[PDB]
Nucleic acid binder design. Structure first.
Length: 75
DNA sequence: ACAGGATAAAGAGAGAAATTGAGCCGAGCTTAAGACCTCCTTTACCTTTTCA
């Protein structure tokens, strides 16, 4: 959602501002405090911002190394 | 990008319910020994047959 894009942009801007102010890469807790949000929310945003990798990425393709969901004939 | 506005769908606050497990008990249950009554076996002695 658009609000998520705006949240990610604000997180990037805050991180750059803290890096400029403190002269070093900010930690997760520092960013979470500055954003006034829990660290778990920040990690959730970071995980949801990822781009999906295509199944045909060379490793040979990625799609030939992923098992299938089901009950093993043995089970 | 950023600000405002509308809304619904998904969290926190409390008690009351419902469970829950915990101790502390004696009621239900098992174990073992001994005695003790049916059922059966086998004997000793017969009686009771069919036959030369």
């Amino acid at each position: 959602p658009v609000h998520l894009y705006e949240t990610i942009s604000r997180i990037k801007k805050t991180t750059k501002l803290l890096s400029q102010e403190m002269g070093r890469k900010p930690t997760e807790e520092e960013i979470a405090t500055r954003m006034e949000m829990t660290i778990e929310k920040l990690r959730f945003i970071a995980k949801s911002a990822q781009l999906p990798i295509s199944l045909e990425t060379p490793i040979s393709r990625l799609g030939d190394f992923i098992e299938a969901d089901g009950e093993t004939p043995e089970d």
